[PDB]
Amino acid sequence: SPTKAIVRLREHINLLSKKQSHLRTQITNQENEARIFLTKGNKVMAKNALKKKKTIEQLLSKVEGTMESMEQQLFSIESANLNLETMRAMQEGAKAMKTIHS
Numbered sequence: 001s002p003t004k005a006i007v008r009l010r011e012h013i014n015l016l017s018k019k020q021s022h023l024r025t026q027i028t029n030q031e032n033e034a035r036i037f038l039t040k041g042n043k044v045m046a047k048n049a050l051k052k053k054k055t056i057e058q059l060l061s062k063v064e065g066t067m068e069s070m071e072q073q074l075f076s077i078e079s080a081n082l083n084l085e086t087m088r089a090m091q092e093g094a095k096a097m098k099t100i101h102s
Contacts, residue, residue: 002077002080002081005074005077006074006077006078009070009071009073009074009077010074012070013067013070013071013074016063016064016066016067016070017067019063020060020063020064020067023056023059023060023063024060026056027053027056027057027060030049030050030052030053030056031049031050031053033049033052033053034046034047034049034050034053037049
């Protein structure tokens with residue numbers, strides 16, 4: 001059923017939002033690593049920690065983009081159901097017109 005499909009998509013998004021929070025935390029951690037090297041004076045390793053920060057940022061974008069795709073599919077399903085209800089409404093309007101003509 002499309003309701004079950006929606007529930008599953010929400011379940012996948014929830015798991016991805018756990019990955020999101022993890023990766024956002026890792027981004028802060030990689031920044032902190034770089035800041036530690038900056039206070040040590042090792043700008044080379046600080047830049048390398050920022051390279052790792054950017055790597056996690058790219059992974060975060062992948063997770064967030066995946067959730068977007070799942071939401072688009074989810075909303076498409078809900079929209080399809082709203083279109084079926086709009087169709088039903090139009091069919092009852094047609095029935096009213098049939099009564100007017102009859």
